[PDB]
């Protein structure tokens, strides 16, 4: 029910040259509303069929405290481009793991990782309840509101957001034939299931300070030939609860359908009764502090591995072979004609 105001942004707001970080498709600028003196941020988000459906979804998720609040969206022209000017709540707390990065003396406890995951879960539970399947939930998209400890973790980066069908999968049976039956295409099954996949990774990162995948691999939960106990190595996973160590197994299940849902994750005892959670100390604060340079690569491989858990609906369909043509196709088909004329004489 959002109405995009069509009037110039400078009539209500004051745009400054102060940069609030570089986005993916433009620059983020500081912006104030004169009638409220309220500081905000500004997103360019060039107009297109993709941009208007995203803002339509990020608008609906605004009434959720763990999701950044869209304040209003304009449709103006900047640099001769048809743009959808987006104004947002200014997030100053920084990245979620940068707050855990700099920790003075108080050690990270497993309980502290519970309300953090309960916070992220409340955002995914809201999005899935209204059938918007965010599929870019990663550390750099989890910003706090302020440097003050009273900050609230929020979800951002709705670039890959998607409205999906609320069709619970019918949960494949235990009895399967020897042969592999031809798969029925159900690409929407990767929409919600990709969300929970990020939940297990984030939950895994929090407890040990590093991701499951060693390198050019994925979701495998090793520079030597390990035969067992590779799932949660003991040097940092020793004092972790068994109920928690097995929840990550459900969230990082290789199968999208058999993966744990968001209704179950929010109803799990470690998330439901988060108050009576063990206070065991962790090694996140120290593991992240051990190498800041490796942490940036952690953000890179997670983004690349995220593409395998999601479906790029904005990609072409391969045409039927007879309807397509390319240099190599005609190089073979024109050669086929040469034998015909050669057979004549």
């Amino acid at each position: 029910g959002l109405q995009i105001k069509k009037n110039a942004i400078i009539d209500d707001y004051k745009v400054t040259s102060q940069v609030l970080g570089l986005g993916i498709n433009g620059k983020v600028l500081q912006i104030f509303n004169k009638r409220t003196q309220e500081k905000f941020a500004l997103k360019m988000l060039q107009d297109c069929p993709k941009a208007r459906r995203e803002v339509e979804l990020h608008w609906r998720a605004s009434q959720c405290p763990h999701i950044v609040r869209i304040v209003d969206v304009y449709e103006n022209l900047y640099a001769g481009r048809k743009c959808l000017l987006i104004v947002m709540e200014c997030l100053d707390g920084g990245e979620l793991f940068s707050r855990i990065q700099d920790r003075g003396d108080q050690a990270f406890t497993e309980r502290e990782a519970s309300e953090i995951m309960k916070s992220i879960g409340e955002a995914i539970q809201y999005l899935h309840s209204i059938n918007i399947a965010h599929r870019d939930v990663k550390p750099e998209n989890l910003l706090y509101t302020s440097k003050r400890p009273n900050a609230i973790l929020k979800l951002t980066d709705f670039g890959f957001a998607k409205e999906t069908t609320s069709h619970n999968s019918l949960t494949t049976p235990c009895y399967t034939p020897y042969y592999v039956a031809p798969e029925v295409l159900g690409p929407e099954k990767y929409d919600k299931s990709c969300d929970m996949w990020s939940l297990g990774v984030i939950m895994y990162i929090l407890l040990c300070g590093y991701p499951p995948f060693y390198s050019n691999h994925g979701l495998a939960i090793k520079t030597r030939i390990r035969m067992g106990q590779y799932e949660f190595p003991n040097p940092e996973w020793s004092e972790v609860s068994e109920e928690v160590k097995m929840l990550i197994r459900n969230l990082l299940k290789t199968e999208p359908t058999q993966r744990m849902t968001i209704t179950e994750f929010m109803n799990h005892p470690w998330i439901m009764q988060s108050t009576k959670v063990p206070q065991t100390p962790l090694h996140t604060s120290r593991v992240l502090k051990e190498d800041k340079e490796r942490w940036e690569d952690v953000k890179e491989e997670m983004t690349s591995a995220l593409a395998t858990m999601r479906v790029d609906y904005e990609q072409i369909k391969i045409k039927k072979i007879e309807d397509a043509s390319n240099p190599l196709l005609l190089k073979r088909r024109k050669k086929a004609r040469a034998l015909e004329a050669a057979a004549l004489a």
């Binding site: 993916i24 498709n25 620059k27 072409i316 073979r332």
Partner: protein
């Protein structure tokens, strides 16, 4: 040359003005653009943090030297490499330009029901591309459905040369992605003599014919179970070739099973497609079919042309196994950026 600044992908881009309409792609720092000097629509990749560690600086020089030598219609081919820096003192950024494609197999499998004629031409160019890359001594090591870009019509190009090297007797173990890796890697340490990618296409070839994963190994150990379930447990003739002792005891712990006829698992598949899969999924690495022999298979009688399957000039190592300072790899990368001669679009 003259560049123009532009903020994209959380960084600042200054590329030559011959590339206009720079637009992001997604997860992928790559940008889709239009090349004015060639009239084509190309993609420009920005290497984020190319020189931060000895491994990163060394891998950038190793990677860039590989794209230079790749000259196929089924392998990714570097059209242009540049840098906004005028001299080495200000050299801290690099870019790469190549053809824009449109899709990759991984997203195609989860989106399209591929036909038998699709697999014939898709796998053909992989093997035709496999012949080139293997002509020069090299192992791709990362063949998987997410590394084979596919255009709108039918053209595909191999990608991701990040982990590839001139074949040697001993080399880094645990390399390929498991679901598309050979059983040689964990069984034998310095094994995998240019056969994982052939084994990987066999995994990829069954991906297109089915739509699901052949070997979706949950853990490292579960991979050995799902593989040996289809290819059968190795006999004592082959069980002596195993390197590790703790591994040999594991293989001897499963219920012993033989190879099943692959035509019993792939229902409705082409008997020639199954016949090729039987040759690409042999436990004996020395007996598995090669890419040069795979093109002569009757599965590609519609597209096989022995006069249009070119080979490579051998690529020598020349610095790839040395260990130098960060600045040395940055200069060695620089020497190969200016020495790049773009090819004419005949």
């Amino acid at each position: 040359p003259t560049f123009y600044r532009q903020e994209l992908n959380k960084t600042i881009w200054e590329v030559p003005e011959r590339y206009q309409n720079l637009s992001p792609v997604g997860s992928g720092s790559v940008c889709a653009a239009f090349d004015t000097k060639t009239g084509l629509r190309v993609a420009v990749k920005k290497l984020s943090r190319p020189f931060q560690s000895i491994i990163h600086a060394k891998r950038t020089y190793r990677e860039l030297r590989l794209l230079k030598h790749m000259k196929h219609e089924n392998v990714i081919g570097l059209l242009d490499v540049f840098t906004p820096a005028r001299s080495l003192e200000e050299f801290n950024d690099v870019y790469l330009v190549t053809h824009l494609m449109g899709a990759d197999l991984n997203n195609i499998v989860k989106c399209q029901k591929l036909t038998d004629d699709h697999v014939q031409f898709l796998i053909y160019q992989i093997l035709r591309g496999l012949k080139y890359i293997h002509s020069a001594d090299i192992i791709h090591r990362d063949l998987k459905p997410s590394n084979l870009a596919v255009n709108e019509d039918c053209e595909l190009k191999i990608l991701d040369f990040g982990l590839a090297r001139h074949t040697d007797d001993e080399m880094t173990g645990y390399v390929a992605t498991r679901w598309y890796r050979a059983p040689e890697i964990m069984l034998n340490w310095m094994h995998y003599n240019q056969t994982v990618d052939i084994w990987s296409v066999g995994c990829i070839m069954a991906e297109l014919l089915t739509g699901r994963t052949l070997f979706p190994g949950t853990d490292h150990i579960d991979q050995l179970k799902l593989i040996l379930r289809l290819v059968g447990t190795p006999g004592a003739e082959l069980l002596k070739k195993i390197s590790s002792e703790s591994a040999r005891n594991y293989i001897q712990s499963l219920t012993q099973m033989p190879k099943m006829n692959f035509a019993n698992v792939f229902i409705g598949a082409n008997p020639l497609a199954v016949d090729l899969l039987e040759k690409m999924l042999v436990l004996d690495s020395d007996k598995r079919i090669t890419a040069a022999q795979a093109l002569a298979h009757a599965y590609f009688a519609q597209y096989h042309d022995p006069d249009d399957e070119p080979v490579a000039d051998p690529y020598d190592q020349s610095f790839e196994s040395r260990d130098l300072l960060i600045d040395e790899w940055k200069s060695l990368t620089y020497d190969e950026v200016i020495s790049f001669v773009p090819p004419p679009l005949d």
